[PDB]
Write a protein that binds this ligand. Structure first.
Ligand SMILES: O[C@@H]1[C@@H](O)[C@H](O[C@@H]2Cn3ccnc3[C@H](O)[C@H]2O)OC[C@H]1O
Length: 312
């Protein structure tokens, strides 16, 4: 109505953001975080590198801060992420066979247990597949453990947390293609055999002017397998600097994404990967690309803001 939180709340869906706990000391950042979202996810604080820097030695300070923030502001807490090929410490990469599998399972158990009852959902496994279909080719988990690591990770997560929503997350799976198809088969297989799995996340790290037209259809087929779906890391990057046309297209793109979710009853909601363009991860990875978020570098609402409110 007046804020995006109000729009999402009124719609009965979630609208979250990727939080960097250190930014909470920046008043403006905190103000927008407090009033514009009803869900929070750690942008980096709950990743392996941030939680288990050395074998069986945990660092929960940053993760705890994110969790405390959600509880203090009354927002849903989304966990990210227990098993991922990236931001994996070297000590883990140096392990093999049973040693590596145990380190993985111990990591999953310790983190899930630590945040049990606080984190409502977990990206148990992140980016297990590859563009073009099949499994990811540069993953330590796939290379050292094979196809069964995903099931192992999920069963371990349920073992630790009996009620948390266990999700599998990925990108380039927004549309119906080889990658999402392989992801589709896995989800169907898991539900078929009783492997703990409750949700599927579609990152949605999109490019301005390029939103899958079959996004809704894709979300629906997964929802129909008996699992919830969610846009987890939404941001739509453009060639910087921005201009009127790019901002208008971006706004329209944000609208399409949110509408596709609104059109699927089991789509829990949408989470944007950050608040302001001044801290977005995009520029540092894509030279000359950026302005992908809802707020600009001066915290002024971009036209994408109105588009999101409308879609909800
Ligand atoms: O600070 C950045 C984070 O923003 C970044 O988050 C990543 C973004 N991303 C793109 C594709 N897949 C993903 C991951 O799910 C998500 O964790 O990670 C790197 C940090 O330097």
């Amino acid at each position: 109505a007046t804020t995006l939180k109000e729009a999402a709340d009124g719609a009965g869906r979630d609208f979250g953001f990727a939080l960097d706990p250190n930014r909470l000391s920046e008043a403006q950042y905190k103000a927008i975080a407090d009033s514009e979202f009803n869900l929070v996810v750690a942008e980096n604080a709950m990743k392996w590198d941030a939680t288990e820097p050395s074998q069986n030695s945990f660092s929960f300070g940053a993760g705890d801060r994110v969790a405390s923030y959600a509880a203090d502001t009354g927002k849903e807490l989304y966990g990210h992420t227990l098993v991922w090929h990236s931001q994996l410490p070297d000590w883990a990469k140096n392990l093999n066979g049973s040693a590596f599998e145990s380190a993985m399972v111990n990591h999953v158990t310790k983190v899930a247990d630590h945040f049990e009852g606080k984190v409502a959902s977990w990206d148990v496994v992140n980016e297990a597949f590859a563009d073009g279909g099949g499994r990811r080719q540069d993953s330590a988990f796939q290379q050292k453990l094979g196809n069964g690591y995903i099931e192992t990770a999920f069963r371990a997560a349920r073992a630790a947390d009996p009620t948390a929503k266990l999700c599998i997350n990925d990108y380039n799976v927004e549309g119906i293609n080889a990658k999402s198809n392989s992801l589709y088969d896995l989800v169907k297989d898991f539900k078929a055999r009783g492997v703990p799995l409750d949700c599927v996340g579609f990152q949605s790290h999109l490019i301005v002017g390029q939103v899958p037209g079959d996004f809704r259809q894709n979300l629906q087929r997964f929802a129909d397998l008996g699992v919830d779906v969610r846009i987890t890391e939404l941001d739509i990057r453009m060639r910087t600097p921005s201009d009127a046309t790019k901002l208008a297209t971006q706004a329209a793109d944000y609208k399409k994404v949110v509408q596709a979710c609104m059109q699927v009853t089991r789509c829990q909601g949408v989470t944007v990967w950050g608040i302001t363009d001044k801290y977005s991860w995009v520029p540092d990875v894509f030279p000359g690309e950026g302005a992908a978020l809802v707020w600009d570098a001066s915290y002024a609402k971009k036209p994408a803001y109105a588009a999101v409110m409308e879609a909800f």
